[PDB]
Amino acid sequence: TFGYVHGVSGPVVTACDMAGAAMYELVRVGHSELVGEIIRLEGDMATIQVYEETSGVSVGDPVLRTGKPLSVELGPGIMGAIFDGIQRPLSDISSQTQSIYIPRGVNVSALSRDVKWDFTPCKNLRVGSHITGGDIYGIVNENSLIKHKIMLPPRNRGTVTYIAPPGNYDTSDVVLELEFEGIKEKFSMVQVWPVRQVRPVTEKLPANHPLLTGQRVLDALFPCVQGGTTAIPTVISQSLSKYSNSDVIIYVGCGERGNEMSEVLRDFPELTMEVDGKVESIMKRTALVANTSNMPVAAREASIYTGITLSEYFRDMGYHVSMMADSTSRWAEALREISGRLAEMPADSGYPAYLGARLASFYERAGRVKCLGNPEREGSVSIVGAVSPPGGDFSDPVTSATLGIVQVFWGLDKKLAQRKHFPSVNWLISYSKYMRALDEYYDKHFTEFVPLRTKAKEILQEEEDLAEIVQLVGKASLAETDKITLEVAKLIKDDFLQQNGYTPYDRFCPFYKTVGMLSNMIAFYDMARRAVETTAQSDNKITWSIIREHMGEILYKLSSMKFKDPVKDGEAKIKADYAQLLEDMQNAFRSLE
Amino acid sequence: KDRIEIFPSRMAQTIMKARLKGAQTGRNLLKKKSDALTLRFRQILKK
Amino acid sequence: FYRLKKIQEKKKILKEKS
Amino acid sequence: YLSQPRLTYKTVSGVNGPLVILDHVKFPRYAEIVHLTLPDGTKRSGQVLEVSGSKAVVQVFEGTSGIDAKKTSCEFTGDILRTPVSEDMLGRVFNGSGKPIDRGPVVLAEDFLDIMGQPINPQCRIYPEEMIQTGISAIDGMNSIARGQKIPIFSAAGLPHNEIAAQICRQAGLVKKENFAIVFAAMGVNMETARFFKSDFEENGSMDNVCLFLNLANDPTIERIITPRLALTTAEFLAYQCEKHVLVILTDMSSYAEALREVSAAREEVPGRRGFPGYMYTDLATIYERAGRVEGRNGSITQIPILTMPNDDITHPIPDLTGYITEGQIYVDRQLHNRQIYPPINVLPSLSRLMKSAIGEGMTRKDHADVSNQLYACYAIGKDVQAMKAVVGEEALTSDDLLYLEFLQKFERNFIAQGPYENRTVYETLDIGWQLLRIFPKEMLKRIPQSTLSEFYPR
Amino acid sequence: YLSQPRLTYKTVSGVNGPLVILDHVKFPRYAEIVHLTLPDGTKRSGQVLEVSGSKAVVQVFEGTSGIDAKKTSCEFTGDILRTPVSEDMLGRVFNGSGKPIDRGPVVLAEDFLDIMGQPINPQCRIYPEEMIQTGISAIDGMNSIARGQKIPIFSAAGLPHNEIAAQICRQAGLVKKEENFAIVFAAMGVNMETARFFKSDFEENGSMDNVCLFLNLANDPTIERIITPRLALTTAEFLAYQCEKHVLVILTDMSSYAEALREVSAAREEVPGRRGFPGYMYTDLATIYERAGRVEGRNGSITQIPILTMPNDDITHPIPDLTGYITEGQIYVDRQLHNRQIYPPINVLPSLSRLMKSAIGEGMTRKDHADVSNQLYACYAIGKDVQAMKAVVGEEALTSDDLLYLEFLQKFERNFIAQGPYENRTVYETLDIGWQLLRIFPKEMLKRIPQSTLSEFYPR
Amino acid sequence: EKKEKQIEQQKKIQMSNLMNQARLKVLRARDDLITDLLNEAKQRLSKVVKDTTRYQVLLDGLVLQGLYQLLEPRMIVRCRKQDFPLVKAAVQKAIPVYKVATKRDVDVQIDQEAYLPEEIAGGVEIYNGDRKIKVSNTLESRLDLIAQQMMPEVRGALFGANANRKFLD
């Protein structure tokens, strides 16, 4: 309960009179109450690392012992709140202090202790019902979209002897008093869970449903699933926040720059979404974790664990969370400097030896689960990491030890950026290992797409092993089946994998229109191949350069598929246009032969 | 003239392994493009 | 190699004092 | 045996990372297992790291997050880490620590074997003789694996080496013209490839051959180091005491060495070359050299390690030392995976250094030597014509360089291309291999001698 | 207040390089300034680096020659390093420790701020949405600086990155279409010829009434160079976030900051990270740089231009690799332009400013700024390819359109990049220089410029 | 033909998923026979603690087995409530038999404040002087140690030998 500072030495504090102190448990160092973490016991002393600036901490300062490690507050009031990497609400320290600064040792509640929430019990409990860890006993109308479900803590069970009457409550009163055998206890409306502990589940279901990202590339050739893990080495993350099939977004910037973090907090309360014809601010179904590089280095490493623990909490209600964890490589640079303070031996380029263990302890909390509780729920957490290598390599220990863990790699390069292509998709080092899990969704609902996806990845590959000779030799003595797979292959690279994100046709790409565009482009490839191979020996052998001059008006309708608006036009107004065009592609070849 | 100016690091080892490998693929073209042109060059002397 | 070794003996000097 | 009761200390002198250091210990053994129980009740396990007089340094497996030096009880065992082996564990799925995860019961032991293992006497080895038939044509036709060979599969991240490993395990057997088993160790896997391995082998009907050790990525990095030693002590019971032929597949041995480098640096050791431990050559050798046939017993162990080369580097010390102890390589290639070929196995760099003893008459068939090196020459001469055709064009190629480009379109799509469920037996990877060698006349096949050209070409 | 008297210990129990440890010290703070007295009568000053029980080590700033374990008294102030901060220090010159070296009085403080500062709330930070014009055409025409940006000028040893910095200090200002604009110039580790030049340039041109100058020489101690960029920002975080001015901070030779931060950390026998620099250098560069930007509520902003020296022109050194991880662009003073006698030798092909889109346009400069800039950048990129290729293939392969990208390249490097160190161009006469350089090309060849702005500004 | 290659694969999944739980259901019916054989060895163990002439000679073993493991100069023995004289008459016969075997001196005394809970089946627990190192020499923790190291031998006697195991080394 009481320690004393025996000696500080930089951000590491040695405390005495700490006999029963646990590892990684929280302490309040100093007279200003700096939050710390016990990292090394030696007998009755306790080496503490301080989560704040240590200047002015004398010896003989009191060290309060709490009994609980670094943990977040879970409850109603989270959605819309701007937190820190140790969950300090930055939109309320700016009010209760009325300054531009974060003073040392602030103790602001992470959830507000003044807002009255409308409690609604689950109408199937009573005074004398049996309830165990995970059973929903309340519903809070947090805002219009989120039905905030109150849940029992895991490893807590018994019989209810007090349920709270439906009304309006704050997050401090005693809403639930169930009893275990002999001992009565009390539950509030907020719960507290340690950020390095996995929130428990019943079973981990396979991730078999596609995460609809709003784009044409990355959703046909390299698909992601609900419950999957990606890597992006803001137009891919802002697109998922408006249109995708996720009900809670969690944006976690670990060590991002100050002006690029003040950019996002300016932009998200202006964004809108389309729910039922009404427009709604997207800051009703997201919560950010703001963290810059001026912040404590101990609160930058913990921002990833706070972000996924917040992400796992809204999973258990039954929502499908999608967490974007921006700048994973900044998070590893927080692991490099903690390990240097401990005098830990580095393994690879100064990074600790456990860089892969900590990343697999974060990326493997994603996935579709069967949620712990009574009403048979099902939620999921998608994690979208973002490695920033030192100039686009797989040599650093952060980029290469992410690709040994994740399943999707949305591999981007810097050379393929000045084409004004936008995205900077590479499609040679980018993969997706959710092609075998999605062989049931594609074959049942879409039943045609896997052989077109097999061909369309091949046409863009045969172009590569031609293009080195097309540069050096230059199209002089070439076969005519290769001129198909350079002009049809060019038609893909400007009309299928080409985007521009502020336009009224290319901010959402629905998937039935996405397979509708490839249903014509592969058919034009195979009919150009079947023409050139059966008319290779008989009489009046043709090349490509007699077709593209003759069928110049066919190559305009096959190039004006990306410019049809998916938003103004009808749902069936776009497939018939792609089904009428096929008979302008089946009859058109029968005008040459 | 004897070294390309870069400083020794782990990343700068993979870039000078790629540029060496990205040069051996250029020479492999030009080693056989000359002989493919020499394949036609003997036939003109054989004509 | 040496600098990570030298900080280890200084931890052993700190432990034979106690 | 060990009939004395066990001491349960609560004299913890400190915690420093993953190390718990006790004091006043009565005669502590080295590498002895302890069982820590936390204040709240969570039982964790750990292994003794260093003893010194009355001290013991214990490396807790599941971390030290919640251990205090006042109320933690650390019960010593007195015996080192051993496994229970049985023949009825063929058909189970264990994790890295050896506990079942297939809703199964605990394995009733026939023996308790020390998992570190003793080396084999080098006089008591026999040279590998017969063939292990995998079912993949690219490693049975041209890169054949003996009985007792150690041949690693070299690949990279993103490449489908994990489905090659699952297709070997479904179809591995003998070379038929009751004693075959497979011990599949999976180190450093994620969840979505753990339920690929757990689901593929159990509903493709051949779970009864395979004993699956699945060590996850989120599981402790010490439990990844005892995973290939649990799998090889099971294989050394099943083969050298039950006379089975065992195939031992170790998946992603570059993930073993990333957990060995992590366990070494958390033991407060100083790293060696490229950060890896200095004893990395004699640490893989304790795994790989648990193989081969033995004198006086009818079993064998053939190993197939699998590697992931970072940045496609070969001078990295995980492929450097694997190619230094093991005999050949397989070389899953990236330029074939982009062209949609399964399995994407490159032939030109791959090699089996004991392939000339696993083939022949009375082992596979008489022409398996002469077919394989003939398809190897025509695969190389075609791939020069493949690049040369782009330089000069099609109108400049003769009726010689068209036989090699028409063979090359059918060697990659019929010999290399297999599909994941098509078990080509080795008698059918030669008839595939002959009906590509009929695109050429008998005046062109230089690598085949004329006596077997008369017996196998005309059909 | 602080009423208790201060203890003057004489119990020096060991000297080790710059470090002095003591004994029987009663409750010693961390980073508490002490005041040493030498035996011969002189005084020094120190800082407490590590306390342990009744023992505190002291990092003496000015040296350690003469400190014996018998007669040197250490007086413990019981307070961290706080510096006297006022608004009338605009127009003074202080050294690296805060002492004035303009033969003037010590500064009469308004409020004693702490030089470590406080971290700015990210919920109270606004995006930079105007421009600081700087007089130099290559930094205003093509790499425009937003008010609240951090854009380092990379350079090498021997290039004119001091005359550039002094030109920016004389010609900075708003984009007027001035009482609340100020410069805070910090020079860390300059030689004697540079800090006489910085002092004889800001009196010779009369631009002293808004500039504070924190000189810190190479013969000066190595710890004053550590606390120099925290005096210059605490003065800047007062002038913008309390006195509502637009401040521009110039930190000349930030590579010598990382040479002192390596020297301080080696004295404490600490672990080195990448290439000898400490492990904590990424969070110690960002302790300096992230004291910038506009805030909500106040009407001031802080812009930072640090200035580096890449060793042997290697951009992959940890001082440019880690300052390009926190800041928002580069300027790249080039050597190949200096060796052909061009001033300022700014390489516009690798230079960038990531916040150029929120500094130009209607209301800020003019509506043709964003299209002139990336068109001059395209005809300078093509021009550098033509002369790279015409040296390797020969002179007679140039067509007549192809020589036109070399007429631009010569006239770009003489009318746009060549400036002369006392020629102060506003932004309206960088674009009117840039527009008569785009008329070198015909209208059909300017394809980076839209037609709706080609039909207003191009024909004359 | 593609649909007909599909269901025939779907036929072998059903036959494999049932042969898989066949080996598990028969491996659990081998585990239940073991865990109930130990329940009969837990009840036959408590038919000896009712005896006294066969249990006083056993508690001479379990106490002196603990006083040799600790070897502390002051040990403390816990027991049950009604088993105090059978533990005390075992302690008194042990301290001279200790001293002739170890050349040590001990102050070993029985804890009269905290008892072993009566639901256990017998045995003792020996602590050191300040109760920091303890030795569980109860009978339930001795049957658990003995039987797990006899699991190869009870398997070799109950269910027969291994029909394929040729060697033992």
Q: Residue A563: exposed, middle, or buried by beta-carbon count in 10 A (0-12, 13-18, 19+)?
A: exposed
Q: For residues D317 and D273, give the distance between their C-alpha atoms in angstroms, rounded to a whole number.
A: 8
* Segments making up each domain of chain A, as ranges: 1-70, 71-114+188-432, 115-187, 433-589
| Residue owning tokens 């995973």 | D227
In 3D space, the residue among D345, D343, D370, D341 whose CA is nearest the CA of residue D355 turns out to be D370
Q: Widest CA span of chain A, in angstroms?
A: 100
Contact by Cβ (8 Å): A143, A284:
yes
Q: Which two tokens stand for residue F85?
A: 């004289």
Q: Which residues pair with A65 in a beta bridge?
A: A27
- Domain assignments of chain D as residue spans, ordered by start: 1-459
∠ CA A462-A468-A470, nearest 5°, is: 85
C-alpha distances out from residue A534 to A119, A477, D406, Å: 74, 21, 17
Q: Strand F123-127 vs strand A71-74: parallel, antiparallel, or unpaired?
A: unpaired
Taking the Cβ of residue E292 and every Cβ of chain A, the question of whether any pair is shorter than 8 Å is answered with yes
Q: Are β-strands E246-252 and E301-307 bridged in parallel, bridged antiparallel, or unpaired?
A: parallel
- d(Cα D310, Cα D319) in Å, to the nearest integer? 9
Q: DSSP string covering D146-165, please?
A: ESS-B-PEEE-TTSSHHHHH
Strand partners for F153: none
CB contact under 8 A, D391 and B14: no
List, in sequence order, every residue forming a beta bridge with D300; answer none if it has no partner. D245, D293
Q: Are D369 and D356 in contact (CB under 8 A)?
A: yes
Angle, alpha carbons E206-E212-E217 (nearest 5°): 105
Are D56 and D25 within 8 A, CB to CB? Answer: yes
Angle of helix E428-438 relative to helix E404-415, nearest 10 degrees, comes to: 160
At position A350, the amino acid (one-letter code) is G
CATH of the domain at F66: 3.30.2320.30
- Phi-psi category of E293—alpha, beta or left, where left has phi over 0 and alpha has psi -120 to 50? left
d(CA E26, CA E4): 13
D274 vs chain B: nearest CA distance in angstroms? 10
Give the closest-approach CA distance of D63 to chain A in angstroms. Answer: 10
Rounded Cα–Cα distance for residues A127 and A130 (Å): 9
Buried b (16+ CB within 10 A) or exposed e, D57-67: bbbbbbbbbbb
Nearest C-alpha of chain C: how many angstroms from D13? 12
Strand A286-289 to A158-163 pairing? unpaired
User: d(Cα D303, Cα D146) in Å, to the nearest integer?
Assistant: 10
**Other beta carbons less than 10 A from residue D269's beta carbon:** 15
CB contact at 8 A, E83 and E98: yes
Closest CA to D391 of A486, B25, A468, B27: A468
Number of H helices, E strands in chain B: 1, 0
Method: cryo-EM
Of E151, E148, E154, residue with least CA distance to E358: E148
As beta bridge partners, residue D376 has none
Q: Looking at the DSSP assignment, which residues form a beta bridge with residue A15?
A: A5, A46
Calpha distance A323→E113 (Å, rounded):
40
* Cβ-based interface (< 8 Å): residues of C facing A: 4, 7, 11
**Long-range Cβ contact pairs of B8-14 (< 8 A, separation 24 or more):** B9/E316, B10/A349, B10/A395, B10/A396, B11/A390, B11/A391, B11/A393, B11/A395, B11/A396, B11/E316, B12/E316, B13/A395, B14/A393, B14/A395, B14/D311, B14/D313
Within its chain, how far is the Cα of A562 from the centroid?
A: 27
Bond before D343 cis per omega within 30 degrees:
yes
**CA separation for the pair E147, E302 (Å, rounded):** 7
d(CA D385, CA B34): 15
CA–CA dist D337, D431 (Å, integer): 25
**Which residues share a beta bridge with D166?**
none
CA distances from A546 to A479, A538, A552, A592, F125 (A): 15, 17, 10, 9, 98
List the resolution, Å. Answer: 3.7
d(CA D409, CA D335): 15
Amino acid at D60: V
DSSP E71-119: T-EEEEEEEE-EEEE-STTTT-EE-TTS-B-SS-PPP--SEEEETT--P
- The neighbouring-strand residues paired with D113 are D83
Q: List Cα–Cα distances, D315 to A409, D307, D319, in angstroms.
A: 25, 13, 7
User: In the 8-state DSSP scheme, what is residue E37?
Assistant: E
Residue A343 contacts C where some CB pair is shorter than 8 Å? yes
CA–CA gap between residue D250 and residue D233 (Å, rounded): 13
Token duo for residue D326: 């093991």
Facing residue for D391 by CB, picked from B14, B17, B32: B32
Nearest alpha-carbon partner for A16 in E54, E33, C16: E54
Strands A229-231 and A378-385: parallel
* CA–CA distance, D403 with D382 (Å, rounded to integer): 9
Instruction: Give the other-Cβ count within 10 Å of A474's Cβ.
Output: 9
Give kind and range of the element (H or E) at residue A331: helix A328-341
- E213 in Cβ contact with E94 (< 8 Å): yes
Q: Show the domain range for F138.
A: 42-156
- What 3-state DSSP class applies to A14? strand
3-state secondary structure of D129: coil
CA A335, CA A324: separation in Å to the nearest integer? Answer: 19
Distance CA E343, CA E161 (A): 10
Q: Count other C-beta atoms under 10 Å from residue D274's C-beta.
A: 15
Tell me whether residue A593 is exposed, middle or buried, using C-beta atoms within 10 angstroms of its C-beta: 0 to 12, 13 to 18, 19 or more: exposed
Q: Is A454 on the interface with B (CB under 8 A)?
A: no
Rounded to the nearest 5 degrees, what angle is found at the Cα of D149, between the Cα atoms of D348 and D164? 55
- Residue E449 is encoded by which pair of tokens? 């410029």
Q: Concatenated DSSP letters for A174-218? A: --EEEE-SS-B--B-S-EEEETTSPPP-SB-----SB---S-STT
From residue E372, alpha-carbon distances to A193, E134, E430 in Å are 56, 18, 10
Rounded Cα distance between E57 and A54, Å, is 16
Torsional sign, CA E405, E408, E414, E417: negative
* Residue among B21, B42, B39 at smallest CA distance from D388: B39
On chain A, the residues whose CB falls within 8 A of the CB of B31 are none
- Alpha carbons A314 and A187: distance in angstroms, whole number: 19
Structure tokens at F3: 């649909």
C-beta separation of F29 from D108 below 8 A: no
How far is A294 from A291, CA to CA, in rounded Å? 8
Contact call for residues D336 and D347 (beta carbons, < 8 A):
no
Specify the 3-state DSSP secondary structure of A431.
Answer: strand
Contact call for residues F59 and F87 (beta carbons, < 8 A): yes
A373 phi and psi, to 5 degrees?
150, 180
Please report the number of interchain residue pairs, chain C to chain D, with beta-carbon separation below 8 angstroms.
Answer: 6
Q: Measured between alpha carbons, how far is E374 from E432 in angstroms, rounded to an integer?
A: 15
Q: Tell me A232's DSSP state.
A: -
Distances (CA, A) of F79 to A565, B42, D430, F43, F64: 84, 106, 77, 20, 14
Interchain CB contact of D327 with A (< 8 Å): no
Query: Least CA distance to F153: which residue of chain D?
Result: D110
- Which residue's structure tokens are 């041995």? D253
Contacts of C8 (CB under 8 A, 6+ apart): D268, D270
User: Which of B11, B29, B33 shows the shortest C-beta gap to A390?
Assistant: B11
Q: Distance (Å) from the C-alpha of residue B3 to the closest C-alpha of chain D?
A: 22
DSSP secondary structure letters along chain F: -HHHHHHHHHHHHHHHHHHHHHHHHHHHHHHHHHHHHHHHHHHTTTTTSS-STTTHHHHHHHHHHHHHHH--SS-EEE--STTHHHHHHHHHTTHHHHHHHHS-----EE-SSS---TTS-SEEEEE-TTS-EEEEEESHHHHHHHHHTSHHHHHHHHS---SS-----
D4–chain F Cβ distance below 8 A for any pair: yes
Which residue in E18, E2, E70, E20 sits closest to E40, CA to CA? E70
Distance CA(E124)–CA(A261), nearest Å, equals 11
**Which chains have 3+ CB pairs within 8 A of E?**
A, B, C
- Which residues are CB-neighbours of D395 under 8 A, at least 6 positions away? A477
CA-based R_g, chain A, Å: 29
E239-263 burial code (b ≥16 CB/10 A, e <16): bbbebebbbbbbbbbbbbbbbbbbe
- E80–A contact, CB cutoff 8 A: yes
With beta carbons less than 8 A apart as the criterion, state whether A496 and A518 touch: yes
**Separation CA D162–CA D200 (nearest Å):** 12
Question: What's the CA angle centered on A117, arms A116 and A123, to 5 degrees?
Answer: 140
**Per-residue three-class SS string for chain D:** CCCCCCEEECCEEEEECCEEEEECCCCCCCCEEEEEECCCCCEEEEEEEEEECCEEEEEECCCCCCCCCCCCEEEEEEEECEEEECHHHCCCEEECCCCECCCCCCCCCCEEEECCCCCCCHHHEECCCCEEECCCHHHHCCCCEECCCECCEEECCCCCHHHHHHHHHHHCECCCCCCEEEEEEEEEECHHHHHHHHHHHHHCCCCCCEEEEEEECCCCCCCCCCHHHHHHHHHHHHHHCCCCEEEEEEECHHHHHHHHHHHHHCCCCCCCHHHCCHHHHHHHHHHHCCCEEECCCCCEEEEEEEEECHHHCCCCHHHHHHHHHCCEECCECHHHHCCCCCCCECCCCCEECCHHHHCECCCCECCHHHHHHHHHHHHHHHHHHHHHHHHHCCCCCCCCCCHHHHHHHHHHHHHHCCCCCCCCCCCHHHHHHHCCCCCCCCCCCCCCCHHHHHHHCCC
Helix F140-148 vs helix F151-158: angle between axes, to the nearest 10 degrees?
70
Q: At D388, give phi and psi (nearest 5°).
A: -65, -35
Q: F133 in helix, strand or coil? A: strand
Does D315 contact chain A (CB < 8 Å)?
Answer: no
Distance CA E130, CA E308 (A): 25
* Contact call for residues B11 and A393 (beta carbons, < 8 A): yes
Could you give the CA distance from residue A173 to residue D451 in angstroms, rounded to a whole number?
Answer: 95
**Distance linking the first and last C-alpha atoms of chain B:** 46
Q: Between B and E, how many CB-CB pairs are < 8 A?
A: 12
Give the Cα separation of F94 and D205 in Å (integer). Answer: 62
Helices then strands, each counted (H, E), chain A? 14, 25
Q: What angle do CA A239, A240, A242 make, to 5 degrees?
A: 75
Which residues, 6 or more positions from E55, have their beta carbon under 8 angstroms from its beta carbon? A7, E13, E21, E22, E23, E25
CA distance F155 to D84: 12
Q: How many helices (H) and strands (E) does chain C have?
A: 1, 0
Q: DSSP alpha helices (H): ranges in A21-147?
A: 90-96
Answer whether the bond into residue D105 is a cis peptide, omega within 30°: no
Please identify which residue in the block is written with the tokens 């950060």: D275
Question: DSSP label at A568?
Answer: T
CA dist., res. A559 & res. A548, Å (int):
13
Query: What CA–CA distance (Å, rounded) separates A533 from E344?
Result: 63
Residue E311 DSSP one-character state: G
Please state the separation of Cα E150 from the chain's center in Å. Answer: 9
Question: What does the block give as tokens for A341?
Answer: 């303070």
Structure tokens at A102: 């974060």
Tokens in use for C8? Answer: 């280890």
Helix axis angle, D317-325 to D281-288, nearest 10°? 50
Q: What span, in angstroms and rounded, lies between the C-alpha atoms of D161 and F152?
A: 39
Helix (H) or strand (E) holding F127: strand F123-127
Q: Which residue in E241, E56, E248, E13 sits closest to E148, CA to CA?
A: E248
Burial class (CB in 10 A: 0-12, 13-18, 19+), A78: buried
Nearest to A460 by CA among A421, A497, A423: A497
Backbone φ, ψ for residue F28 (5° rounding): -75, -25
**Which of A41, A190, A36 lies closest to A109, judged by CA?**
A190
